[PDB]
Amino acid sequence: PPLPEYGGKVRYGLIPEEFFQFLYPKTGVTGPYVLGTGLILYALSKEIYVISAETFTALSVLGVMVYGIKKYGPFVADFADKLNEQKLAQLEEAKQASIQHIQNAIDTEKSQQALVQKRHYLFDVQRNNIAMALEVTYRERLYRVYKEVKNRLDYHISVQNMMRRKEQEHMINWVEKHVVQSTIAKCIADLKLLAKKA
């Protein structure tokens, strides 16, 4: 339940405004003051209020009280209001802090769900590596078989080739060795053509 905002509009700290309004319609604006004057003067004049040392004790206390409220009243009012404003602000900030905490928890949870949704890459990576290893090994095997058969066939052709080469070399050096083992007809025909050289 919310409090009202203002109090009851007392006057001189001793008489509520309800009284002045209640006596307005029948005795104007000066009716209450005339009544107060009359009652004060009647109490004095008839010794209902005996003037004594308590008159001056009361005057001094009332003076100190009026001076006190008039001088240190603004400060106490503002102090109470600031106390309330500080408690209110602290509570509001605690509220916003709890709101932010639970929003951060929700966000964190949605992020974790995104991560756990991304999980499948570990297993498709493992499948990638298995497939790639099997294919590399297959092609390496086909290259091995190819390269072995080709190496054997080209070894055959190379031994035949260099055999033919060395055999032809011995052949040629035999045919030279054989002219050493062995008629000036061409000699004269050579000089005959040398004469036609002129």
Binding site: R141, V145, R152, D154, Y155, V159, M163, K166, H170, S182
Partner: protein, 67 residues
């Protein structure tokens, strides 16, 4: 053509090599084995004349699942 007549006879003496692998060498094999040594060992280290039998290995594999 004296020397062209000359030559023909010498290639014929050469072609007379039915039983002669290297035409009356009496040598030149002692190094040809060295040559053939190099040639065979540098093509491979096996009975190249015969077909190669093929042994094949299979890839290793490990514990991959989440430990």
């Amino acid at each position: 053509q004296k020397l062209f007549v000359d030559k023909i006879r010498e290639y014929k003496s050469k072609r007379q090599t039915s039983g002669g692998p290297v035409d009356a060498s009496s040598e030149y094999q002692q190094e040809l084995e060295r040559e053939l040594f190099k040639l065979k060992q540098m093509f491979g280290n096996a009975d190249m004349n015969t077909f190669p039998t093929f042994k094949f290995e299979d890839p290793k594999f490990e514990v991959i699942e989440k430990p």
